[model samples]
Target chain A: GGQQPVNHLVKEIDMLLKEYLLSGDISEAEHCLKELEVPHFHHELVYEAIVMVLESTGESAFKMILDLLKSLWKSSTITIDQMKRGYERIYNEIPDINLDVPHSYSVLERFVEECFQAGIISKQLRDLCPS
Target chain B: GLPLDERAFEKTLTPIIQEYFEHGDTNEVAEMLRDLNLGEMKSGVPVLAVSLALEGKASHREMTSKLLSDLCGTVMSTTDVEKSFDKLLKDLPELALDTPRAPQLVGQFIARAVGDGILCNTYIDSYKGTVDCVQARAALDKATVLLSMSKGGKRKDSVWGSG
Candidate 1:
């Protein structure tokens, strides 16, 4: 029987996140990410990382998540536009994200500020972000 | 012992690639390649990867494209990647037996490798004019369309949107 197709990227991102949290190895995460290459989809990595940031109460993850973004950014593996787009996407869906993680708005603001402070995003872009 | 003979490396790599199709694990694929002594048969990396993907599903073709790029600096150089593309043009008809659309599929991955920086921009130019083989011709045309879309900025969404 012929089966319908699939999009593994959606499933793939979750695996990367979980592995990062468990291993706490940025290189391992980077090694995992190289195979999923596509600058276009690199934004998904950003979107997923911050969303995981919002969902976590563990403050230790705060440093790890942001650090990974910093590494990817420095390596030029992710673009500022893609980073912007990922945050913009989360902005458009804050209400939906709120349903799963209450206080998403404030936390997202903190996340953006943290990103700005870390230089992962631009100052202007952080100002544009809401929720 | 001495480095794995170039010819012997090909046979050793085939099962490893076949194993990748079953597991879909790039880390393991890299681990195995790193473990082996390829006699620096770097050009064979892309040729064999694309050849295996031709006989597999469309999804694996995408996977192999990424693998080629992932291996680019670590294992195969940029030239290794392009050198293989040069050879692939001649091998298209032979590869088409497994998948009739192998030409288009090969073209698509060739375009992907170019964007991934594994192959140079000039490799795509080799097919700008008419190619003798119809299979190779289809591959060239397919490469052009995919690269055009990538340039149009549709690559972001279409990257995963592609089946």
Candidate 2:
């Protein structure tokens, strides 16, 4: 708990990267998640729950969260759910997800690919990825 | 073969989904104001209610810009903002907090409003404590000035963040 909740989330996420590169499955990720010792339902559930509460509480926090989520996703550090949530939050809460913005989803798929290419998943999984 | 598993994808998507929901909620608030005719009830609210009212019947884009700008300036946590909203909702009794797709919708709205300008500064310091996110408010200010100066779209830029 010394680390911030967001930090905890990111750290666990980093752990996932480490695990996958070493083991090739989320079971260890699951074990890492169990060791978190935080109260929620699961890692992603808790992550989303706490983030929702944080955003609902303030704008600066909300903005910080938005910025963090985007940076993580753009860099290929988050899961599809997190990435989707980031994109959806912009659209759902901000009232201007794509008003003047261009190429909203381009970097989206690419970043995911970057994660895959980095050996986060098995070659078979990468091969299964649609072009 | 690389290690592929559901956990990896889950970790990857966690922040994305969180962001999607947060941005979605803000957009829902904007849509509610726009659709429920609540933007007009500016006189009784706090801060620049007068300014919002004066700008109420303006262009949809302009009005959206105003709200976005306001949110950026008033970066109070949702709890604080919700308190104001709760009081307002009690008086109005017509507000709806239900929007299944709220986060995704807001993302599109922001993209439309900000265009191409990336966030650069806090709105409070720049605009005297009356905007949304610091950077977003700054971009909005710049956009408004540019809009006033020129005659059309100016390809503005903005930044997004989460913590």
Query: What are the runs in model 2 whose C-alpha is more than 4 Å off?
Result: A1-70, A73-113, B1-45, B48-163
The digit string of per-residue lDDT tens for model 2 on A1-131 reads 12112223332344333333322333333444545554332325324522342334444343343334344444444565443443344334322433454343343345345545644434443343333
lDDT of each: 0.71, 0.35
Clashes of 1: 0
Clashing pairs in 1: none
Docking class of 2: incorrect
Q: Relative to the unseen true structure, what is the C-alpha lDDT of residue A35 in candidate 2, on a scale of 0 to 100?
A: 53
Task: Give the Å error, residue A72, model 2.
Answer: 2.9
C-alpha displacement of B19 in model 2, angstroms? Answer: 33
Superposition error at A16 for model 1 (Å): 34
The candidate that achieves the highest TM-score relative to the unseen native structure:
1
Query: Candidate 2 on B1-163: residue-level lDDT in tens?
Result: 1224534533543443234233334444444334433332321222222122222332222333444445443443223332332232232212113422122122223233334222222321344445344333322333333323222323322121343
